[PDB]
Amino acid sequence: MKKIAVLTSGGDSPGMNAAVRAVVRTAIYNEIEVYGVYHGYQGLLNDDIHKLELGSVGDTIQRGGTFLYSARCPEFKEQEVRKVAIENLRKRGIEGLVVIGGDGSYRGAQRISEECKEIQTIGIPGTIDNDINGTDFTIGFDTALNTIIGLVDKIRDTASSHARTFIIEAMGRDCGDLALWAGLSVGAETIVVPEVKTDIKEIADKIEQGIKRGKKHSIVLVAEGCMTAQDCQKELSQYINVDNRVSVLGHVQRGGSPTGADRVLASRLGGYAVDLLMQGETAKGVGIKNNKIVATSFDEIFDKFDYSLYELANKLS
Amino acid sequence: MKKIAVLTSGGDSPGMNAAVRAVVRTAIYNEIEVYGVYHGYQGLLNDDIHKLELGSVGDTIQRGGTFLYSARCPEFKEQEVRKVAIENLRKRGIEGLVVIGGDGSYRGAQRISEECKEIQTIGIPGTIDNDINGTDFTIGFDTALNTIIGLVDKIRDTASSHARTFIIEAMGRDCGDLALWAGLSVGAETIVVPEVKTDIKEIADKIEQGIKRGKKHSIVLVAEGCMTAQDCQKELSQYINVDNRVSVLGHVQRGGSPTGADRVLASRLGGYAVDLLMQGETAKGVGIKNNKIVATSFDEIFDKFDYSLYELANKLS
Ligand SMILES: Nc1ncnc2c1ncn2[C@@H]1O[C@H](COP(=O)(O)OP(=O)(O)NP(=O)(O)O)[C@@H](O)[C@H]1O
Ligand SMILES: Nc1ncnc2c1ncn2[C@@H]1O[C@H](COP(=O)(O)OP(=O)(O)NP(=O)(O)O)[C@@H](O)[C@H]1O
Ligand SMILES: O=P(O)(O)OC[C@H]1O[C@](O)(CO)[C@@H](O)[C@@H]1O
Ligand SMILES: O=P(O)(O)OC[C@H]1O[C@](O)(CO)[C@@H](O)[C@@H]1O
Ligand SMILES: [Mg+2]
Ligand SMILES: [Mg+2]
C-alpha cells in the first residue's frame, strides 16, 4: 500500500476538509504517497489527479466545503466509463482509494474494488443528511444541526415579537434526522418528518388547542423529505387560518466551519480509512456506532430513525 | 411520586436550562407537581423552594446558565445540616429530587436518599469538564468544546499574521477532555493534559524540530488540570526562546447558548430522570454510554481518557 488516492463526492459537508487532512497526514506519516482527485468521480475520469504534500492540507481543518471539489458524474454507472477511471489510477501505481461522500459515492467505490484487483477502496460517510448506513452520525450532521438551530433561534425572536407562526423547511433529503434533532433543540411545537405518518388535520388541531390555552404562535419544522414548507402551509390553511410565514433554510445548511464533533469524527474516520487500507481491507464504509469506530461492508451498508426521540420532542412541546 | 423537586448545583454549564425544562415538562405531562429549588443546596437549606408551572420554563431551552441558580453549600457535608434540607422537602410532600450537577452534587443526592426514606434522588451530569462517571459526555461539554474552538480559531488568525506561538489555557478541572478534543479540532501542535506524562523538554524539541522544517509558530493547548499556561510558558523558556503569548480562555467556556448535542442530551436525561423516579429508582446518575441512555448507581459512579484519541492528534500534528 504505497500509493493512495482520496476524493470527495456527492453533496459537500462541513468536515470533509478535516477528513481529507487526516487521510493525507496519516498516509504521509506511514510513508505512503497520496494523490488528490479533484471534482469527485469526474476528476477520476478527466485525470485531474495530483500528488498532495503535507502543506497541501495546511489551513484546512477549520474550513467548510471540500478543497478537492465535488461534481456529479452519472456516467460512472457505466462499467466501460469506469475502465478509464481505473486506468487513470493504475497509471500512477495507486493501490488504495478513499472516497468521502454518500450512498452514491460508496457504490462508485464498490464498483472500483469489484473491477480492479490491484485497488482497495474505503468509504468515509460525508453528508449533512445523516442518511448513510454503517454510522450513527455522518460527517456534517452535527454542523448542519447547529446551523439550523442558530437560524431558527433567530426566527424565534421575530416570531415572538409578532406572534407569528413559522413553517420552516430543513434539509435532509429522505431523512428526518436534521428536522428531528433541530426541532427538539428549538422546542418546535410540530416536527414533520417522512418516517412518521403525517397528519395535517392533527397538526392543525394541536395548534388550535394551543391558541385557546394562550400560546399565540408556533414553529413547525418540516423535513424536505416529507413535503415542502409551502405545501405544508397550503394544506394547513384548509383546516386553520393562522398568521404565518414560510422559511426555506436552504444551502446555508451545507456550509460553515465544522463543529468540534465533526472535526473529531472526520479526523478519526480519515485516519481509520488509511489504517484499513494498510491492513488489506476493501469495500467497506467506516463509521461510529455506539461510540466505537467501526467498518462495515458496502453490502451490509446497502442492504436509524429514533422514534423514541420523536416521541420525547412531542411530549416536551 | 406526586411531587418532585429539581435543582442545579456545582459549576453551571450550557444545557442545564434544557435539562430543567425537560424535568419540568416531563413531570407536568405525568401529572406530577414540580418545585424549583434555587441556589443549589443553599436553597434547600434556606427553603428557597417554589412550584414551577409549564410557563416557568418557557424561553429557556436555548439559554445558557441555570435560571435556578447555583451556589456552594459546603455545610451540606454535615448530616445535621442535611436534616434541615430534608425537612424542607418533606414539609411540602416532595417524594423525588432531581439534582443537575457534578460529583459533589451527586454526593449530596446520595446522602439525601440514604437519610430520608420517603425521598428518591436522581442525578443528571451537568458540567463542561466532562469529568463525571456514568456518562461518556456531560451536559455542557459539547458547547464548551465549541466555545474553545471558536476562540482558538480566532487566535490562529493573529498567530499566523505575526508568526507567533500561543500557549492557551483551557478549562477542565482535572480532566483533559476539553484540551484534547479542542486541540485536535484546531490542529494544535502540542496538547498538554494531566492524564499523560508531561515532557516539557520534549515539547521544546518538537517545536524546534518544527522551525528548522519551516513552521514558524504553533498552538499549545494546555489543560488547567496539568499546569497554568504561564507556568508552561516559564518552563518552556528554559529549553527554548520563541516569540509567544499566553491566553487564558477562562469563564467564557462556561457560557453561551448550548449546542444541539447539549440540548438533545439534556432533554433526554431530564426526561429519563423523571421516568426513573416514577419507576421507584433512587441513588443513580443518568448518562449516555456507547450511545444508549443508561442509569448507574452513585456507588459505581464514585468508585474515560482516550489515549487513542491523544495519539491521533499527535500523529496529525
Ligand atoms: N450505482 C452507482 N454505481 C456507480 N457509481 C455511482 C452509483 N451511484 C452514484 N455513483 C457515483 O457517485 C457519485 C455521487 O453520487 P450522488 O448520488 O451524487 O451523491 P451521494 O454520494 O449519495 N451523497 P448525497 O449528495 O447525499 O446524495 C455520482 O455522480 C456517481 O459518480
Ligand atoms: N461529599 C459530600 N457530601 C454531601 N454534600 C456534598 C458533598 N460534596 C459536595 N456536596 C454538595 O454539592 C455541592 C456542589 O459540589 P461542588 O464540588 O461545588 O460541585 P460539583 O457538583 O462537583 N461540580 P463542579 O463545579 O464541576 O465541581 C457542594 O456545595 C455541596 O453542597
Ligand atoms: O445541493 P443540491 O444539488 O441542490 O441538492 C440538495 C440536496 O443535497 C443535500 O443538501 C445533501 O445531500 C440534501 O439535504 C438536499 O436535499
Ligand atoms: O467557576 P470557578 O469557581 O472559578 O471554578 C473554576 C472551575 O469550574 C469549572 O469551570 C467547571 O467545573 C472548571 O473547568 C474550572 O476549573
Ligand atoms: Mg445520492
Ligand atoms: Mg466538585
Side-chain angles (χ1 to χ4, degrees), chain A residues 1-200 203-204 206-277 279-303 305-314 316-317, chain B residues 1-200 203-204 206-277 279-303 305-314 316-317:
Chain A
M1 179 52 64
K2 284 259 113 99
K3 310 201 184 185
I4 71 180
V6 57
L7 70 72
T8 53
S9 179
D12 72 329
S13 78
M16 285 187 172
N17 284 321
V20 166
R21 179 182 175 268
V23 172
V24 167
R25 291 179 113 86
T26 301
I28 290 174
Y29 177 79
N30 291 272
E31 288 172 75
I32 298 163
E33 301 159 82
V34 203
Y35 298 76
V37 174
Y38 293 79
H39 310 279
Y41 290 120
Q42 276 298 358
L44 227 44
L45 284 193
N46 301 347
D47 202 40
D48 202 352
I49 306 180
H50 304 270
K51 189 184 188 142
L52 295 179
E53 323 278 0
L54 282 173
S56 69
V57 301
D59 198 29
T60 65
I61 196 177
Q62 83 290 356
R63 293 291 297 266
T66 161
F67 77 95
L68 286 187
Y69 308 123
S70 167
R72 279 166 201 142
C73 179
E75 61 266 60
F76 211 75
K77 274 161 169 124
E78 303 292 300
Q79 194 168 276
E80 266 245 320
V81 161
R82 295 201 289 275
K83 292 229 132 53
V84 175
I86 283 163
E87 229 317 273
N88 282 343
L89 287 176
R90 302 302 301 123
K91 280 202 308 198
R92 291 167 175 87
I94 293 167
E95 295 168 73
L97 176 65
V98 177
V99 165
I100 301 151
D103 211 305
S105 305
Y106 276 21
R107 294 176 175 287
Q110 202 192 34
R111 292 310 198 180
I112 292 172
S113 190
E114 285 169 356
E115 303 171 4
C116 172
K117 183 168 87 174
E118 287 83 32
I119 298 168
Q120 299 156 246
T121 66
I122 299 292
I124 294 174
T127 174
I128 68 162
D129 294 339
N130 209 38
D131 67 338
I132 298 168
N133 291 346
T135 202
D136 291 347
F137 299 102
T138 59
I139 299 169
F141 172 69
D142 192 70
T143 307
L145 169 55
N146 289 292
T147 289
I148 295 160
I149 292 168
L151 300 177
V152 183
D153 281 354
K154 294 198 166 172
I155 295 168
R156 291 208 82 121
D157 289 331
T158 193
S160 292
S161 297
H162 292 278
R164 193 162 293 146
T165 297
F166 281 81
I167 303 154
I168 309 181
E169 188 179 314
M171 274 180 165
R173 200 181 297 278
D174 298 317
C175 186
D177 289 7
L178 278 172
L180 168 54
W181 278 70
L184 191 34
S185 302
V186 310
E189 286 82 0
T190 306
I191 305 163
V192 177
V193 298
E195 297 97 336
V196 172
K197 288 168 192 77
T198 38
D199 200 5
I200 291 294
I203 295 165
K206 297 177 179 179
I207 299 172
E208 208 202 296
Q209 293 177 335
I211 305 289
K212 253 164 134 180
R213 282 188 195 165
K215 172 184 246 74
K216 295 181 179 175
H217 68 282
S218 69
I219 300 294
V220 183
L221 193 44
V222 178
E224 62 175 7
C226 181
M227 62 195 313
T228 69
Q230 293 177 335
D231 295 345
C232 185
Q233 176 194 60
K234 295 177 179 179
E235 284 183 26
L236 271 165
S237 74
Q238 294 174 339
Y239 309 106
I240 199 178
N241 176 337
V242 292
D243 184 358
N244 80 85
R245 303 281 189 277
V246 159
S247 310
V248 169
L249 299 181
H251 292 78
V252 184
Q253 294 170 95
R254 299 267 290 283
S257 179
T259 63
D262 280 329
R263 298 183 198 190
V264 176
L265 178 65
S267 285
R268 290 172 87 188
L269 299 185
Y272 188 41
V274 177
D275 293 341
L276 286 164
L277 293 175
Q279 299 161 17
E281 304 280 353
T282 197
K284 312 216 171 177
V286 300
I288 1 95
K289 219 134 107 221
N290 303 324
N291 208 33
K292 291 180 179 178
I293 301 308
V294 295
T296 303
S297 78
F298 283 152
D299 279 332
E300 224 190 303
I301 294 166
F302 299 152
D303 278 355
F305 189 78
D306 194 339
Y307 288 108
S308 230
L309 204 54
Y310 178 87
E311 171 170 66
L312 182 62
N314 283 48
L316 299 184
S317 126
Chain B
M1 179 52 64
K2 284 259 113 99
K3 310 201 184 185
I4 71 180
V6 57
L7 70 72
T8 53
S9 179
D12 72 329
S13 78
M16 285 187 172
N17 284 321
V20 166
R21 179 182 175 268
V23 172
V24 167
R25 291 179 113 86
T26 301
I28 290 174
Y29 177 79
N30 291 272
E31 288 172 75
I32 298 163
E33 301 159 82
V34 203
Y35 298 76
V37 174
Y38 293 79
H39 310 279
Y41 290 120
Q42 276 298 358
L44 227 44
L45 284 193
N46 301 347
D47 202 40
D48 202 352
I49 306 180
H50 304 270
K51 189 184 188 142
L52 295 179
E53 323 278 0
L54 282 173
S56 69
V57 301
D59 198 29
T60 65
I61 196 177
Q62 83 290 356
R63 293 291 297 266
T66 161
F67 77 95
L68 286 187
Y69 308 123
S70 167
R72 279 166 201 142
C73 179
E75 61 266 60
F76 211 75
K77 274 161 169 124
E78 303 292 300
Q79 194 168 276
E80 266 245 320
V81 161
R82 295 201 289 275
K83 292 229 132 53
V84 175
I86 283 163
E87 229 317 273
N88 282 343
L89 287 176
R90 302 302 301 123
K91 280 202 308 198
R92 291 167 175 87
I94 293 167
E95 295 168 73
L97 176 65
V98 177
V99 165
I100 301 151
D103 211 305
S105 305
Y106 276 21
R107 294 176 175 287
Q110 202 192 34
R111 292 310 198 180
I112 292 172
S113 190
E114 285 169 356
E115 303 171 4
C116 172
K117 183 168 87 174
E118 287 83 32
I119 298 168
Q120 299 156 246
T121 66
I122 299 292
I124 294 174
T127 174
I128 68 162
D129 294 339
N130 209 38
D131 67 338
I132 298 168
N133 291 346
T135 202
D136 291 347
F137 299 102
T138 59
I139 299 169
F141 172 69
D142 192 70
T143 307
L145 169 55
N146 289 292
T147 289
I148 295 160
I149 292 168
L151 300 177
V152 183
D153 281 354
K154 294 198 166 172
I155 295 168
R156 291 208 82 121
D157 289 331
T158 193
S160 292
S161 297
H162 292 278
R164 193 162 293 146
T165 297
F166 281 81
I167 303 154
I168 309 181
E169 188 179 314
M171 274 180 165
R173 200 181 297 278
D174 298 317
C175 186
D177 289 7
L178 278 172
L180 168 54
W181 278 70
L184 191 34
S185 302
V186 310
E189 286 82 0
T190 306
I191 305 163
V192 177
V193 298
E195 297 97 336
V196 172
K197 288 168 192 77
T198 38
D199 200 5
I200 291 294
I203 295 165
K206 297 177 179 179
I207 299 172
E208 208 202 296
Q209 293 177 335
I211 305 289
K212 253 164 134 180
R213 282 188 195 165
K215 172 184 246 74
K216 295 181 179 175
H217 68 282
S218 69
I219 300 294
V220 183
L221 193 44
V222 178
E224 62 175 7
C226 181
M227 62 195 313
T228 69
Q230 293 177 335
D231 295 345
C232 185
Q233 176 194 60
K234 295 177 179 179
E235 284 183 26
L236 271 165
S237 74
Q238 294 174 339
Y239 309 106
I240 199 178
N241 176 337
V242 292
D243 184 358
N244 80 85
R245 303 281 189 277
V246 159
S247 310
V248 169
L249 299 181
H251 292 78
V252 184
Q253 294 170 95
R254 299 267 290 283
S257 179
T259 63
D262 280 329
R263 298 183 198 190
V264 176
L265 178 65
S267 285
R268 290 172 87 188
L269 299 185
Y272 188 41
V274 177
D275 293 341
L276 286 164
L277 293 175
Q279 299 161 17
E281 304 280 353
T282 197
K284 312 216 171 177
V286 300
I288 1 95
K289 219 134 107 221
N290 303 324
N291 208 33
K292 291 180 179 178
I293 301 308
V294 295
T296 303
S297 78
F298 283 152
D299 279 332
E300 224 190 303
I301 294 166
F302 299 152
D303 278 355
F305 189 78
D306 194 339
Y307 288 108
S308 230
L309 204 54
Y310 178 87
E311 171 170 66
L312 182 62
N314 283 48
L316 299 184
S317 126

